[PDB]
């Protein structure tokens, strides 16, 4: 029929290791590679153009070499991961990432305010990621090119662009891919009936607590039901970590300058709302995507507070 015409392109799963391919310009990328993406755009149903020659396309890990490369870079073997990452990237590459008070933020789009406050929070706590994909993308994000980092957060969290997201859950996912091995927490629970029992927590469980926003109150003791039915007290015995994260269902809470690192504010309900970020510097700054305001005091519906730590031992 038609004289065969070809171009050379490269396929990849990590945008570093390239794989030479010769493609037939009369067949779609999908017929030759399976699902195929060009900087996030789905080109599966597109036939090669001359302008494509020499360009790099993402594909799914469909042979053993690509499977190993994908696991080594992303630390996942979820079959749909790369598709979800590319689908997110096609949107996040169009977002804007302004510098707000020296931090990379995200201009509002696509219901992304939970991602903005997560990204702002990471830049204020000591954290190293384990997957090279997150290491590389986070470095770019700090420099101001955060599109790949934001698309990876979405893919790791199984959230699509626009989907309702929770900051505490997002942070927990990101912490699972970070090196928290040297973090340790010891708690004690005291019941006037049953007595007392210590517990040691490690890793992500050592830096996250759900039930109170106040780190000081956590050191003093919080009231929880004992398994016997009577009210008991749980308090922090020992902490070794560079930060802690305290979370609670949103409630009116007063943030005092100098007593915390940063916080997440949620205005809304369980199906509808909006996040803002508060950071304690020379004064209290409220970052709302690209928007910035200041105040000497702050009271709002807070749901997460971050604090600095290094080593703490109770006197109780
Ligand atoms: C001897 C004894 C046995 C059971 C309990 N009850 C308990 C222990 C722990 C570790 N966490 C708890 N959360 N709710 C209750 N908890 C206590 C305080 C002492
Ligand atoms: Zn008890």
Residue numbers in the entry: -1 to 314
Text from the published report:
SARS-CoV-2 papain-like protease (PLPro) plays a key role in both viral replication and host immune suppression and is highly conserved across the coronavirus family, making it an ideal drug target. The main protease and papain-like protease (PLPro) are responsible for the cleavage of nonstructural proteins 4–16 and 1–3, respectively. PLPro cleaves the C terminus of ISG-15 (RLRGG) with sub-μM affinity allowing for the virus to delay the immune response, resulting in increased levels of infectivity for SARS-CoV-2 compared to other members of the coronavirus family. Although we were not able to obtain crystal structures with the NMR protein construct, the full-length protein (residues 1–314) containing two cysteine to serine mutations (C111S and C270S) did produce suitable crystals for X-ray diffraction with structures for 3 different protein-fragment complexes being solved.
The X-ray structures confirmed our NMR studies, showing class A fragments bound at the S4 subsite adjacent to the BL2 loop region, while class B compounds bound at a previously undocumented binding site in the finger region. Class B fragments were found to occupy a pocket near the zinc binding site in the PLPro finger region. The triazolopyrimidine ring of fragment 11 is placed in a pocket containing V187, Q195, T197, T225, and K232 with a hydrogen bond to a water molecule bridging K232, while its phenyl group is extended into the hydrophobic pocket formed by V188, G193, and C192 next to the zinc site. Interestingly, the chemical structures of the class A fragments (e.g., 6 and 7) and class B fragment (e.g., 11) are similar in their primary structures, yet they bind to distinct sites on the protein based on the different NMR shift patterns and the cocrystal structures. Despite their structural similarity, the methyl group at N-1 is the key to the binding preference of the compounds. This nitrogen is observed to create a hydrogen bond to a water molecule, which links to K232 in the finger region. Although there are well-defined binding pockets and clear avenues for elaboration in both classes of fragment hits, the increased flexibility of the finger region and variability in binding pose make the elaboration of class B fragments a more challenging prospect. Additionally, the distance of the zinc fingers from the active site of PLPro and the lack of conformational change associated with fragment binding raise concerns as to whether class B compounds can modulate the activity of the protein. However, no inhibition was observed for any of the class B fragments, despite many having a higher Kd than their active class A counterparts, suggesting that ligand binding at the zinc finger region of the protein is not capable of modulating PLpro catalytic activity.
